[PDB]
Amino acid sequence: PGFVGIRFCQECNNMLYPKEDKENRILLYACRNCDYQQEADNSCIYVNKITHEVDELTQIIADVSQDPTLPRTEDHPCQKCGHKEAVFFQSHSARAEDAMRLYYVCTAPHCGHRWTE
Amino acid sequence: PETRIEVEIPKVNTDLGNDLYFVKLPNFLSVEPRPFDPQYYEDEFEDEEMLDEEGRTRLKLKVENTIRWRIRRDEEGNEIKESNARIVKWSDGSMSLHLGNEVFDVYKAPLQGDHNHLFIRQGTGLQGQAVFKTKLTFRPHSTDSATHRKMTLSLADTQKIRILPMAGRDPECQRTEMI
Amino acid sequence: EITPDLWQEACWIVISSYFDEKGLVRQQLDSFDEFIQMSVQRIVEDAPPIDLQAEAQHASGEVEEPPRYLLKFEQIYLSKPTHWERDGAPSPMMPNEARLRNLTYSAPLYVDITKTVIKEGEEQLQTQHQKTFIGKIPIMLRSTYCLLNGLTDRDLCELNECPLDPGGYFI
Amino acid sequence: IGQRIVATLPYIKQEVPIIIVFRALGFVSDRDILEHIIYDFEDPEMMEMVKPSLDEAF
Amino acid sequence: AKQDVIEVIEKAHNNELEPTPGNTLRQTFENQVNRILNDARDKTGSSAQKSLSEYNNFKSMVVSGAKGSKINISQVIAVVGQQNVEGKRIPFGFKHRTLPHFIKDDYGPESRGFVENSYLAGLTPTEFFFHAMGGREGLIDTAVKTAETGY
Amino acid sequence: RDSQITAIEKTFEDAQKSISQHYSKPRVTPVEVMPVFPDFKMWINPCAQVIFDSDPAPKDTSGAAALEMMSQAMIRGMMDEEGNQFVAYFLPVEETLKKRKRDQEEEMDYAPDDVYDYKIAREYNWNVKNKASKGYEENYFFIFREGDGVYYNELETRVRLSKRRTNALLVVKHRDMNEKELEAQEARKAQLEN
Amino acid sequence: MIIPVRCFTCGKIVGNKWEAYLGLLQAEYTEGDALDALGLKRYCCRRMLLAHVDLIEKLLNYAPLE
Amino acid sequence: NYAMKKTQLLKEKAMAEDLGDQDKAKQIQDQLNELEER
Amino acid sequence: AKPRQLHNTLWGMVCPAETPEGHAVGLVKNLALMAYISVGSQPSPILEFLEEWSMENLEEISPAAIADATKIFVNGCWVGIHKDPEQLMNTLRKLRRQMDIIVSEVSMIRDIREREIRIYTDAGRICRPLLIVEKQKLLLKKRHIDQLKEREYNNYSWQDLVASGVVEYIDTLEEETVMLAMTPDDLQEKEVAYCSTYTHCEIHPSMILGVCASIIPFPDHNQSPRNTYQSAMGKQAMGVYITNFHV
Amino acid sequence: LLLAALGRRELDDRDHYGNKRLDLAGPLLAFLFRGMFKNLLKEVRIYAQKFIDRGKDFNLEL
Ligand SMILES: [Zn+2]
Ligand SMILES: [Zn+2]
Ligand SMILES: [Zn+2]
């Protein structure tokens, strides 16, 4: 299925929208103002994850690794750098929050490796 | 690869002694590096305005609590240097700052957190001299004095308010000007 | 460092020092003093200077360029609490005097005003009226602008006042 | 079909679509507008969410 | 009780807990922890009851029915228990935690409001504040219902 | 005006008078009394205050020993890959420290034939502000000399260093100041009178 | 404000001992030792001096009515 | 008698309100006596 | 009900028991013993200090650069973005811990996961002083205490403690990014490390109680609503309200 | 707003004190004084207006 995102008109930088090639029966992207237009890359017009299957890793950030208010474990060495000290916390996202699943981040600078087990 | 930098520059020398203390004086205390002479004196011509009590508050602290030093020649012409401030160490390890006859507390604290260093610039470089290790913190004693009451305003250091001396018949001033 | 045995002593000694340092109404005293010291002046200059133009009488039979008067407020002054007897004779207004005489513990406010008149391109004569009297503002008790400011224990009771009063209220 | 964003501006007797507000501030292209909102264009999920407002101000 | 709660919390953290039909994992988790802590408070209270002599005066005022109940005896002698607001454990008032003294995502007993002391032992500041949070609700409801029932 | 100048003069005459009791806890006694004067030796030097965002101290030295190493460190301005200028921080080895300390025992400012070695430790972004720039705040330092007195200096220039994002060894050989360099100090020295 | 004349609970006169107690208080005596010296053993009597606050000392700060 | 405030207020007012330093000293002499005088 | 309810955010700032039980229940509150309210101060020293730091000023920065950078708000005014804000925060802390550029009231919040820096110098911010904890060890050593027991003679005080960077005023908004210990004498030892990353320690937890609430003996041994009623009843108790009551 | 809408961020709490400020005697009196002073200037305006429209001179002390 993939994931379509916003595209801006090279002419006016306004958002580009999909349009079908009524003749060749294909998908086009066109600016709603100027006739700026290009051929579409996804063949998918839209997607809506009802289950909210999500890569929590995208919203997790390594900067949290230095949060002093975060619990640390010497029990889980970093899978990347092997460092013993790692911070652990839950995925605060509605479906991830309902799942209460834990995320671990390395307490080592420039490593910041974040994983779930 | 080791980048080789060979350079010729004059050395600037500092006599750092045994102990080095960093000092930032609060707004009610100050220090003057020029030797104090009534002639060529700093143009501190504040009073001719016939100042209000906020102005006299700042003026009183500025005039009376500014630490100065001077070169004095004896009858033989030998130069004796006099300063109006001096620091005293006590048997219990405490310290105090003396500004003439008045006495102020001095508490010793080592400099935690701030990495403040003294360097001297020569051309494109800086030559290190020292890192500040301990600082001096001051607080006034002598609570019986009236000067302690007004110092509360000193933090006030666009226009700022003034205090008239409670003088004038103001009701009469109102009544008469409205005629 | 401080042992557990001395940490309890250290803890209440530190708190005692805080109560030596800051009283219980420090934020109020500070706010009123800041109101007097900064906000009141800020409010004074924050006003736009007045530009008034005389209504054309058209008495000249032509479209007149009426003379216009301009005013700008400058320096601000605040006296200490002053009580004027019925005769306007100024005397120090003590909080207890204001309390017994049902007076308002306030100090008169003065402001420097530059008056101005601008007659077209023809000469204009900007003039000034200094230390003009504005209303009287009540002072928050024990603020720096009070008369019982920094006053010692001997003085306050001599002023028939309580030395332990934190202040922070108006009369 | 839904989720248009409107700002309740002071003294404005009616709620105003925010994308118009960005053009009104002079950030006229949608790129500009999102540049002040969608700081990272790598967010398909958030980008898909502002479209109702972008349509209203298209 | 604390150990059992910790073990369940870890299983929950390990997501090993099965959601019952209709209910979710978080809902069954909340239920499990509340159940265990309630059981703990109730069991400890019961043990206190069984220990009270007939000259114990709280019990004398409970069996006469004049004033107090076995739950008050549990709270004074055995344990105060879980302190709830809106019927639920103390919420994460701060960002993902109940107090600045606890760490993020801490579902432990005292971390979520379970007062582990009895009133005779006195409450630690965290659980003291949690008991304060629990006690304020009754006063507010007391003040508004009089206005609803009179109408 | 003259009543205040006169009031100031009184403070100098009074300052030589001896002390006999503590301002509180009168039962205690005084160990040392020192007058405060500007360091007549140090004012001629173009002093700059360097403020780092975080701890620059070398990992192998702890406590009082660590500060000594940093106190004799040398810092130099560089131009990067993009041409933006930055600051390189170089630390002395123990042998450089010995040479610098040795010169104090031999009473020499520097040995004209000796060379002092410094290696770069970190790169920093730089901002230089001095008294001619608007809103500058005065920082001071006092040097305590037991049995002599207290000699102070003012920090006329403030340098703020923050971690930036060339492995360089700075080997420095010293020479005497020329007529223009002495004049460069004296132009700076002129802020001490009239 | 000023020392109570009698112990609230028992009736023992405690008004004639405050100055004596203050004399004892000049020294490093703990509040209990002064009572021991003054012979006040029942806690009903001891509570009287232990809890007293001599505010009348503050009341004297006010200007007098010649 | 209660005029210690009046004398103190008179001396305090004169010191800031009067351009001469002598007035504050003359009031200070009265002020030292004031401790006994009230 | 929320506006009357005792929110977690009130810890140490507002007394949790001292409130009127009538229609003003929960609406009318009373300050904790160590709660201080910022009188307010100008941001000007700080703004130039920020502009000279490694902050791309908002007026200067390219939108693309804002993604991996924290947004700095001063008195809520977004003024710029920073690429290594931890160094910024370290500097800002270091300054406040010396009461130099950053006056003692200012509160600087770094929202780590959110990538926001909110700096407030304005008035009305309720804050309280806290002990600083750099390691699992106190910044406050015996020399400070030895000086302070003699505070009756020498005036050693809070100014020296904060100027020395041993104590700091945390505001409720800043209290969300600090890890706070209750007592150093116990939260510096370990059995199994719970946190190992404390940033502050409570001076004394009993200071969360207010004026009327601070006369209560053994308040942790009472059901809190009773404490609330005493807190209220402490306002109706007769007594010597002032020394000049006869005047 | 989107973050909250996406659920990436929890909603703000109106009762969370981190979102609150207390108006002390300063802002309170300033809020009053601003209004009273600003309107006072209208009094001076109308008074001057009475004299200056007539081309006469307004005594500001009045
Ligand atoms: Zn286009
Ligand atoms: Zn790692
Ligand atoms: Zn008795």
Ligand sitting nearest the alpha carbon of A13: 1
Evaluated on CA atoms B66, B70, B75, B79, the torsion sign reads: positive
Rounded Cα distance between I172 and J16, Å, is 9
Residue length, chain F? 194
List of residues 6+ apart from F147 with CB closer than 8 A? none
Token couple for E129: 């504040």
CB J42 within 8 A of CB C54: no
List of residues 6+ apart from E77 with CB closer than 8 A? E45, E48, E51, E52, E58, E118, E120
> Is I114 within 8 Å of chain F by CB?
no
Residue I96 is which amino acid? R
Cβ atoms < 10 Å from Cβ of B179: 7
Rounded Cα distance between F175 and B11, Å, is 7
CB F156 within 8 A of CB F129: no
3-class secondary-structure state, position A75: coil
Considering only CB atoms, I37 lies closest to which of J16, J18, J24, namely J24
What subunits make at least 3 CB pairs under 8 angstroms with J? A, B, C, D, I
Residue A7 φ/ψ, nearest 5 degrees: -130, 140
Token couple for I189: 């030892």
Rounded Cα distance between B160 and I19, Å, is 40
Residue F82 is which amino acid? E
> Is B56 within 8 Å of chain H by CB?
yes
Helices (H) and strands (E) in chain A, counts: 2, 8
User: Which helix H or strand E contains A17, and what residues bound it?
Assistant: strand A15-21
Angle at CA of residue B107, ends B109 and I184, nearest 5°? 50
CB spacing of B109 vs I144 below 8 angstroms? yes
Evaluated on CA atoms I82, I84, I85, I89, the torsion sign reads: negative
Rounded Cα distance between I210 and I13, Å, is 9
Rounded Cα distance between E107 and C135, Å, is 60
Helix, strand, coil percent content, chain A, rounded in steps of 5:
15, 25, 60
- Please tell me which residue of chain A has the smallest CA distance to J8: A93
Place of tokens 């049995």: F147
Strand partners of residue E131: none
What subunits make at least 3 CB pairs under 8 angstroms with F? B, H, I
Evaluated on CA atoms I186, I190, I193, I196, the torsion sign reads: positive
Strand partners of residue B98: B86, B103
Token couple for B98: 């003396």
CB C139 within 8 A of CB C106: yes
Rounded Cα distance between E21 and F45, Å, is 81
Q: Which of J4, F27, I207 is nearest to D5 (CA)?
A: J4
Evaluated on CA atoms F170, F175, F178, F182, the torsion sign reads: positive
What is the CATH code of the structural domain delimited by A49-117? 2.20.25.10
Q: Which of F96, F34, F108 is nearest to F68 (CA)?
A: F96
How far out from the chain centre does Cα E126 lie? 13
> Is D54 within 8 Å of chain A by CB?
yes
CB B94 within 8 A of CB B106: yes
Q: State how far the alpha carbon of J49 is from the alpha carbons of B147, C73, C117, J53, J59, in Å.
A: 48, 18, 13, 6, 11
List of residues 6+ apart from C4 with CB closer than 8 A? I185, I186
Q: Which of G45, D46, B116 is nearest to F57 (CA)?
A: B116
Tell me which chain I residues have a C-beta less than 8 angstroms from the C-beta of D42.
67
Ligand sitting nearest the alpha carbon of G11: 3
Rounded Cα distance between B109 and B137, Å, is 8
Q: Annotated binding residues of G for Zn(2+), as ranges? A: 7, 10, 44-45
Tell me which chain I residues have a C-beta less than 8 angstroms from the C-beta of D40.
67
Q: Which of E3, E86, E102, E89 is nearest to E38 (CA)?
A: E89
Residue length, chain A? 117
Cβ atoms < 10 Å from Cβ of G9: 12
DSSP, residue by residue, E115-144: E-S-TTT---HHHHHHHHHHHHHHHHHHHH
Phi-psi region of I27 (alpha: psi -120 to 50; beta: other; left: phi over 0): alpha
Token couple for I76: 């809520």
List of residues 6+ apart from H32 with CB closer than 8 A? none
Report the separation in Å between the CA atom of I235 and the middle of ligand 3, taken as the mean of its atom positions: 30
DSSP state of J7: T
Interface test with E, best of A100, A101, A116 (most E CBs within 10 A): A100
CB C124 within 8 A of CB C117: yes
Rounded Cα distance between I156 and B138, Å, is 9
Residue H25 φ/ψ, nearest 5 degrees: -70, -40
Rounded Cα distance between F141 and F71, Å, is 14
Q: What was the resolution (in A) of this experimentally determined structure?
A: 6.4
With 0-12 / 13-18 / 19 or more C-beta atoms within 10 angstroms meaning exposed / middle / buried, residue F60 is: exposed
Token couple for J17: 């004190």
Angle at CA of residue A99, ends A96 and A100, nearest 5°? 90
> Is E15 within 8 Å of chain A by CB?
yes
Token couple for A42: 């996804």
What are the E-state strand segments in chain B?
3-8, 19-23, 30-35, 66-73, 79-83, 85-90, 95-99, 102-110, 115-122, 125-131, 134-140
Rounded Cα distance between B60 and B37, Å, is 19
Rounded Cα distance between B31 and B43, Å, is 16
User: Which helix H or strand E contains C13, and what residues bound it?
Assistant: helix C4-21
Rounded Cα distance between I116 and I106, Å, is 16
CB I145 within 8 A of CB I153: no
CB spacing of D44 vs A13 below 8 angstroms? no
Domains of chain G by start residue, with CATH: 1-66 (1.10.10.60)
Residue length, chain G? 66
User: Which helix H or strand E contains E32, and what residues bound it?
Assistant: helix E25-51
With 0-12 / 13-18 / 19 or more C-beta atoms within 10 angstroms meaning exposed / middle / buried, residue A49 is: exposed
CB E77 within 8 A of CB E118: yes
Evaluated on CA atoms B74, B79, B85, B90, the torsion sign reads: negative
Tell me whether residue A111 is annotated as binding.
Answer: yes
List of residues 6+ apart from C59 with CB closer than 8 A? none
Evaluated on CA atoms A77, A82, A86, A91, the torsion sign reads: negative
DSSP, residue by residue, chain I: -TTTS--GGGTTTB-SS-S-SSTTTTTS--BBTT-EE-----SHHHHHHHHHTTEEETTT--GGGGTTSEEEEETTEEEEEESSHHHHHHHHHHHHTTTSSS-TT-EEEEETTTTEEEEE-SS--EEEEEEEEEESEES--HHHHHHHHTTTTS---HHHHHHTTSEEEEETTTTTSS-EES-TTTSSS-SS-S-S---EE-S-GGGGSBTGGGG-SSGGGS-HHHHHHHHHHTTT------TTTT-
3-class secondary-structure state, position C84: strand
Rounded Cα distance between F114 and F97, Å, is 13
CB J38 within 8 A of CB C42: no
Evaluated on CA atoms I222, I224, I225, I227, the torsion sign reads: positive
CB I169 within 8 A of CB I163: no
Obtained via which technique? cryo-EM
Size of interface C-I (CB pairs under 8 A): 85
For chain A, domain boundaries: 4-48, 49-117
3-class secondary-structure state, position C51: strand
Report the separation in Å between the CA atom of B151 and the middle of ligand 3, taken as the mean of its atom positions: 51
Considering only CB atoms, F1 lies closest to which of B35, B47, B141, namely B47
Cβ atoms < 10 Å from Cβ of F66: 17
Rounded Cα distance between G65 and I245, Å, is 16
> Is H23 within 8 Å of chain B by CB?
no
Token couple for J61: 């002390």
